Design a protein around this nucleic acid. Sequence first.
RNA 1: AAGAUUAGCAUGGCCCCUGCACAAGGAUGACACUGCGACAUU
Length: 308
Amino acid sequence: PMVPNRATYIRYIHDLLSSTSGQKDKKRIIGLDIGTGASCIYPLLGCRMYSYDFVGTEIDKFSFETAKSNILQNNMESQIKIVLRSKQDCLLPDTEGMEEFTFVMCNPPFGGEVGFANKILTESKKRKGIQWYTCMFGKKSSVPAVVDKLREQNISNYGIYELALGKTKRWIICWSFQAMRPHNELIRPSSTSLSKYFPHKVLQNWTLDPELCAQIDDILQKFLDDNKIPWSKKGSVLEISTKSITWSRKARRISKSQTSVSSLEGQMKCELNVIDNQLQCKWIEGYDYNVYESFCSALARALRDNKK
RNA sequence: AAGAUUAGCAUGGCCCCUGCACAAGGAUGACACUGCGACAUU
């Protein structure tokens, strides 16, 4: 029960949505609480921070009266609603002709919490248009048997954020069915104690000298022009929006051929940034990680092999 | 008496080269969803 821990979780939700917002128009963002508890403080803090629109789920009657009492003494009914769900029906509620849910948050009990995440994984396969799913774990030992289940369904857009507040080490496992990819501070922690269950990398760094710090923009423009990768110059940021891989030997051997194979297919949106002689490659959108691993190792080889 | 970290080696994919495809191999520098633990501390 830590107010800075719950606020840090809502701040992870904000950092997860914000780094994965894109260039789209600012719609009203809709959240979905799962098991809001007897306090119901999670959607309250979300609306106090950035004016989200929560339609929370509930399995209790006394806590539903408590949630309505918190609604009555907080008065945000165009933001906060609480809905009693059923036990056999999908706990992820319908759209009902409303505007689509955007992010889903879950405070499971502490079948177990692994089986609860299994039920949410089973129900979440049917919900399209909903972008973000999260689930927070207290025990470290729940990390394997959930992620291994998530290692059964080829879900690559997940992440484990290490909530570190003294003796409180929580692990946020966030998975999504849409291609948006958050930062690397958000999904892969520093401690290697769960290096068996890290998600994939979304950020790569390289360090240079002021010679190559002067030459870094010419190197990046020559790289993104000599490879037919679509790019744009937004300030000092070089943004990249490809819909298939146009940077590998396999891609050339196919391009330099005659068969009717279309392309090696996987969508990527990413950014190149120059911070203090450093080049950062930073992954924004894409279902398949192999596209971004290929691009980051091609960029590493491009920064190395222009030194001679 | 009970185990992690840590320095080298197999394995896995990624960039480069050979290769019609699948393979296989080479070379190379960053990785880890795999292990192998010659020291030293806890």
